[PDB]
Amino acid sequence: AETLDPLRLPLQGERLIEASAGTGKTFTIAALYLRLLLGLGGSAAFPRPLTVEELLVVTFTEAATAELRGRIRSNIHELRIACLRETTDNPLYERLLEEIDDKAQAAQWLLLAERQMDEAAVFTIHGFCQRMLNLNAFESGML
Amino acid sequence: IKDPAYLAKLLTRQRRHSFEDRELPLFRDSENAGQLFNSDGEQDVGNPLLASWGKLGRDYIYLLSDLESSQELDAFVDVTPDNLLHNIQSDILELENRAVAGVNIEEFSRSDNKRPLDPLDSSI
Amino acid sequence: RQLAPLGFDLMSQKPKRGDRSRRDDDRYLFLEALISAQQKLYISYIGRSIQDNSERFPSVLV
Amino acid sequence: MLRVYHSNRLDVLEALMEFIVERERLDDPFEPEMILVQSTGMAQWLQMTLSQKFGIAANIDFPLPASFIWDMFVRVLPEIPKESAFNKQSMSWKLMTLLPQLLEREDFTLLRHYLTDDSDKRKLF
Amino acid sequence: VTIHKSKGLEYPLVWLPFITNFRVQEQAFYHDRHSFEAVLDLNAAPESVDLAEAERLAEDLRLLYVALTRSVWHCSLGVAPLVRRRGDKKGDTDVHQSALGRLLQKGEPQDAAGLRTCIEALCDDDIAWQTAQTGDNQPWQVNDVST
Amino acid sequence: RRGELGFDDMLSRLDSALRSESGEVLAAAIRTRFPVAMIDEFQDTDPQQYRIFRRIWHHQPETALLLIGDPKQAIYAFRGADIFTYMKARSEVHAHYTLDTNWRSAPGMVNSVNKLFSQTDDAFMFREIPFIPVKSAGKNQALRFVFKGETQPAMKMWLMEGESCGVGDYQSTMAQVCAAQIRDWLQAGQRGEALLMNGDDARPVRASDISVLVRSRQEAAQVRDALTLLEIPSVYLSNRDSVFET
Amino acid sequence: QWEPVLTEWITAVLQAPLNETGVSLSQLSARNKQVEMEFYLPISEPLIASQLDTLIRQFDPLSAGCPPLEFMQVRGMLKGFIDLVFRHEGRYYLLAYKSNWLGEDSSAYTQQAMAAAMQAHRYDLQYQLYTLALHRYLRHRIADYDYEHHFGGVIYLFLRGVDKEHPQQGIYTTRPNAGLIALMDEMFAG
């Protein structure tokens, strides 16, 4: 096994994260969501930045999805404030601000993410399956 | 906006008052009207609630400005900012940004630069 | 309210100015309710669940 | 002349409508006054404000925009049928007949895997 | 709060009185160690029963790890030489068949004195043990206030 | 015939759609819909769900798959989850990452967990589930539950004395011992003796801090009956009984 | 089976004129007619039944009997749906329809029976409010308006009482005294 850094994770292929009991898993999902929104990592980064309607988060419990949506919304607002102020009180947010060279475009992307957080693609397992069945109903053959 | 050739056509149009018969410009600063609109065609609205909530209003005022023989008269009663709801309506109507982000340390340390809210104000 | 698209409609793929959408309609209804309030505005929501006292988050507009 | 009156609240627009009515009066006594509304409740509120302003709110029609558009279609263009041939249920009953005729076509090959597998005319409807 | 309902929560002081209680699975429904697919054995073969009991013991160890890692300040455990077998004194106890005794007795069958020495072996500043004393003095004090 | 659907029926219909030949193109439509996936709680994964996630995001470029989970928390085997699906997923993928720091508990509890579960090798008895010693938080290094005298340790294994005991007698004796410890903590908390201390900050132990972790409903009722005898009210958060049966 | 009798009954109703000069319904063009006119009448004073019924009985001759109705003080709006308003030779007229008529089968629906039906069903207040609404509408719409010059009367049509040989049976023409309308407008205004 290897240690996991939230700002050095390669977002290519399949990765298996083993979050132990009591660890900040809900914080790590929000950090990876901000990494996917801003497109950070350098060589281990995503090829292109994605929007809120292209990031898929799958969690079984519905209250867990609501809590994760609220926490990701709060992380988006806090990173937008820290990017507009160029300072923060958190070390992971400090490294996130140090990784980016531009400040205005990232703040505009975080503002668009805060405005499009209502249309976030954070559903459950059965909810995502029902949405994929109702979306492409011709290839699946459903009512 | 659509084109810079459409921006001058919009700048030539003005709104005269219905009762007072005085013409008023469409923008706050006509010289900086090109700096407000981006190259893609989207205006950076200072009010964040109007920018995030009124996209249907954006499309409707765009299609109303797209009309040729339209006659636009403005009758706007100004709201005196005394309450919190009146402060919000004045910030929406006057098209200004009162959300203090605190870009520097002087804006972040001092806190009396915002608007005072009375504790007996039960508006919102 | 977020309304799921039909999946094979051409208006959802290419949006125009005069296109009906439930999300933008509700976000403009909230703005019209904020503007239409003259004296007092009373916004109430479910912040805590009655079953297990779990924290419930409000809307993005609020 | 098309006139659009920008205002913040609806009371100023109601006062402007009152000024337009008191300024220019209708020549015909039985001519209706078309006031387009968003719903029935806004029409009732406009009737309440016109009764509170004028003292009488009578012979004022409040049509919906599609109803007013169809009324202008009837009044301006003659020899128009009262019900359209392109109704929603009418187009559904026509497409129930036209879609099995077009299953042999090459462009409908996405639907041939959707319809010809098992159908008691439920997926077709 | 049950163990499945305590996943993802947080509690300062946690008491686990029946963490040594275990149950033996009788039905033969297991998973293959090579193909990783569910195999249901309708016949009462002892190999499928043992391979299902191994998965049951792994599930009990996962339940023990879930229940232990929810305390913040203090957790208390109830350990006892529980014998699932109907024999009263056969010279051996079934704590090695449980999830708690598999970490204490290191997966080895022992006795009550062996279990006590295995408990007293791993004694640190954080891990301590005491005997279970049955006794009551007074229920509680209300300490009411004026209204 | 009725045109109805169920919760597992959505998984079954999606697996039957992706099992076909044209539905693979539908998976490409999913690759046109979301070219990324972050899947939380991967221990509670049905084999149909992992077959779907392998049908969509196995080895296609530009799309990322992030399976965030924990094999030590798979306790929903009665519901339909399976740890062997997680072991197959661990055998299929190549990279593995783990979190080092623990931010919830005191370092004494973290050291007790790392001491109890690392006695032997592969304490979870499966070869594909390894255990590693986690690290405690630096900001929560001063968490102490103090009694009237010395500092109380993290884990206190109350050993019931005797050679061999049954089930019901052991349950009754440990419930009485737990109720005695709860009433002692509540009696010492209201006088300023038992406290929770973070550095120099102190907090008295109320009734909402102590929680009993049981596994069944009968032993939960036993704990509630043994706790209501000592004038201590208790609630059952896991009570799923209907109000119409009372 | 009712249809060939229904069409000849409809043509017999339409052939019978209902006016003091003998004006039929076929002489009304599409611009002259106004069918189902809805009005909202405002009132700011508390509508007292005792102060209103005496003012009604002062001028209405049909209020000789008919003990007064009881209703609470209504401040706000009054809704109304007039059946037909039509103009003819420079004079406006109101027309309403009543069609229940369960208790009559012979030719006994004379003016006395129709007046007894008006007193029993209390249709005097409805036609008085209709005259007030039409007077206010013609005062607001038409400048330099006179109530005696423009208004002509109110016609009630009983559908089951119209006979081919009896032109008076079925129709009921009543005109106000032109003094109750101004006092009712002053009461409803404030």
Kind and range of the H or E run holding D2: strand D2-6
Going from the C-alpha of F144 to that of each of D116, E65, E126, the distances in angstroms are 71, 22, 11
Tokens of A131: 């949405």
Rg (CA), chain E: 19
Cα of first residue to Cα of last residue in chain F, in angstroms, is 38
Amino acid at position B28, single letter: R
Q: Are the C-beta atoms of residues D68 and D33 closer than 8 Å to each other?
A: no
Contact B56 C24 (CB under 8 A): yes
Residues of F in contact with E3 (CB under 8 A): 75, 213-215
CB-nearest to B102 from A85, A111, A115 is A85
Pairing of strands F64-69, F210-212: unpaired
What domain count does chain G have? 1
DSSP-assigned letters across all residues of D59-79: S-----HHHHHHHHHHHHS-S
Phi, psi of F102 (to 5 degrees): -115, 125
Tokens 């039957």 belong to: F16
Select from F129, F137, F184, F136 the least CA-distant residue to F156: F184
**Contact partners of C by the rule of 3+ C-beta pairs under 8 A?**
A, B, D
Q: Distance between CA atoms of B88 and F17, rounded to whole angstroms? A: 52
DSSP-assigned letters across all residues of chain F: ------HHHHHHHHHHHHHSSSHHHHHHHHHHH-SEEEEE-TTS--HHHHHHHHHHSSS-TT-EEEEEE-GGG---TTTT--HHHHHHHHHH--EEEE--EE-SS-HHHHHHHHHHTTSSS-TTS-TT------EE-STTTTEEEE-SSSBP-SEEEEEPPSS-B-SHHHHHHHHHHHHHHHHHHHHHHTTT-SEEEETTEEEE--TTTEEE-BSSHHHHHHHHHHHHTTT-----TT----GGG-
Q: Is E92 on the interface with F (CB under 8 A)?
A: no
Q: Are the C-beta atoms of residues E75 and E14 closer than 8 Å to each other?
A: yes
We report the CATH number of the domain holding residue G171 as 3.90.320.10
**Chain F contact probe: residue of E15, E60, E111 with most F CBs at under 10 A:** E15
CB-nearest to C54 from A63, A117, A134 is A63
Select from F216, F109, F176 the least CA-distant residue to E21: F216
Residues forming beta bridges with residue F202, ordered by sequence position: F197
Q: Are the C-beta atoms of residues G132 and G185 closer than 8 Å to each other?
A: yes
Alpha helices by DSSP H, A6-103: 25-38, 62-85, 91-99
Select from E90, E88, E120 the least CA-distant residue to E105: E120
Contact D2 B15 (CB under 8 A): no
Residues of E in contact with A21 (CB under 8 A): 65-66, 69-70
| Stretch 34-93 of chain A: residues touching chain E, C-beta under 8 Å | 64
Contact F143 E72 (CB under 8 A): yes
Residues forming beta bridges with residue F231, ordered by sequence position: none
Amino acid at position F35, single letter: P
DSSP C55: B
Q: Are the C-beta atoms of residues F12 and A125 closer than 8 Å to each other?
A: no
**Structural domain of G66:** 1-190
Helix (H, G, I), strand (E, B) or coil at G158: strand
G101 HSE (CA, 13 A, CB side): 20
Q: Distance between CA atoms of A88 and A80, rounded to whole angstroms? A: 11
Contact E73 F196 (CB under 8 A): yes
DSSP-assigned letters across all residues of D28-67: STT-------SSHHHHHHHHHHHHHHHS-EES-----HHH
Going from the C-alpha of D118 to that of each of A130, A134, D113, the distances in angstroms are 21, 19, 10
Q: Could you tell me which chain C residue has the CA closest to the CA of B61? A: C17
Tokens of G54: 């005496």
DSSP-assigned letters across all residues of A77-90: HHHHHHHHHT--S-
Helix (H, G, I), strand (E, B) or coil at G64: coil
**Contact partners of D by the rule of 3+ C-beta pairs under 8 A?**
A, B, C, G
**A66 min Cα distance to partner chain F (Å):** 13
**Chain F contact probe: residue of A124, A125, A138 with most F CBs at under 10 A:** A125
Q: What's the reported resolution, in angstroms, to a tenth?
A: 4.1
CB-nearest to D56 from G31, G140, G143 is G140
Going from the C-alpha of E68 to that of each of E97, F47, F109, F139, G164, the distances in angstroms are 19, 28, 9, 21, 100
Q: Is F161 on the interface with E (CB under 8 A)?
A: yes
Tokens 């019209």 belong to: C32
Q: Is A19 marked as binding a ligand?
A: yes
DSSP B37: B
Q: Distance between CA atoms of F208 and F46, rounded to whole angstroms? A: 36
Pairing of strands E71-79, F155-159: parallel
| Stretch 16-55 of chain B: residues touching chain D, C-beta under 8 Å | 18
Tokens of F147: 């009694």
Residues forming beta bridges with residue F152, ordered by sequence position: none
Contact B76 D1 (CB under 8 A): no
**B103 min Cα distance to partner chain A (Å):** 5
Residues forming beta bridges with residue E30, ordered by sequence position: E39
SS3 breakdown of chain B: % helix, strand, coil, rounded to 5? 35, 10, 55
Tokens of C18: 């005069």
Q: Distance between CA atoms of G134 and G176, rounded to whole angstroms? A: 13
Pairing of strands F36-40, A57-58: parallel
Select from A90, A7, E70 the least CA-distant residue to F139: A90
Q: Is A38 on the interface with F (CB under 8 A)?
A: no
Q: Distance between CA atoms of E95 and E38, rounded to whole angstroms? A: 29
Select from G169, A23, C12 the least CA-distant residue to F137: A23
Q: Is A137 marked as binding a ligand?
A: no
Q: Is B63 on the interface with C (CB under 8 A)?
A: yes
Experimental method: cryo-EM
DSSP-assigned letters across all residues of chain E: -BSSTTTT--EEEEEETTSS------S-EEE-TTT--EEE--S--HHHHHHHHHHHHHHHHHHHHHHHTTEEEEEEEEE--B--SS-S-SS--SGGGSSHHHHHSTT----HHHHHHHHHHS--SSEEEEE-----S----------
Residues of E in contact with F90 (CB under 8 A): none
Exposed/middle/buried for B10, CB within 10 Å: 0-12, 13-18, 19+? middle
Pairing of strands E38-40, E29-31: antiparallel
Cα of first residue to Cα of last residue in chain B, in angstroms, is 34
Please report the sign of the dihedral spanned by the C-alpha atoms of residue E104, residue E108, residue E114, residue E117: negative
Torsion angle (degrees, nearest 10) of CA E67, E72, E73, E75: 0
A44 HSE (CA, 13 A, CB side): 12
Kind and range of the H or E run holding D21: helix D10-23
Pairing of strands F64-69, D2-6: unpaired
Tokens of B41: 């065609």
Q: Is A25 marked as binding a ligand?
A: yes
Q: Distance between CA atoms of E104 and E61, rounded to whole angstroms? A: 12
Own/partner contacts of A76-79, CB < 8 Å, gap of 24 or more, are A76/A34, A76/A37, A76/A110, A76/A113, A76/A114, A76/A117, A77/A114, A79/A34, A79/A110
Going from the C-alpha of B116 to that of each of B84, B120, C40, C42, C49, the distances in angstroms are 9, 12, 18, 20, 34
CA D119 from centroid of its chain's CA atoms: 37
**Contact partners of E by the rule of 3+ C-beta pairs under 8 A?**
A, F
Q: Could you tell me which chain A residue has the CA closest to the CA of F129? A: A18
Q: Distance between CA atoms of E39 and B114, rounded to whole angstroms? A: 68
Amino acid at position G83, single letter: D
Q: Distance between CA atoms of B106 and B111, rounded to whole angstroms? A: 9
Residues forming beta bridges with residue G82, ordered by sequence position: G37
SS3 breakdown of chain A: % helix, strand, coil, rounded to 5? 60, 10, 35
Three-class HEC string of C3-54: CCCCCCCHHHHCCCCCCCCHHHHHHHHHHHHHHHCCCCCCCCCCCECCCCCC
Alpha helices by DSSP H, chain G: 3-15, 49-59, 111-121, 124-141, 147-150, 180-189
Residues of A in contact with B103 (CB under 8 A): 84-86
How many A×F Cβ pairs under 8 Å? 177
Mutual angle of helices A104-115 and A62-85, in 10-degree steps = 150
Amino acid at position F208, single letter: S
Rg (CA), chain B: 18
Select from F225, F213, F217, F224 the least CA-distant residue to F241: F217
Which residues, 6 or more positions from F188, have their beta carbon under 8 angstroms from its beta carbon?
A: F147, F148, F194, F205
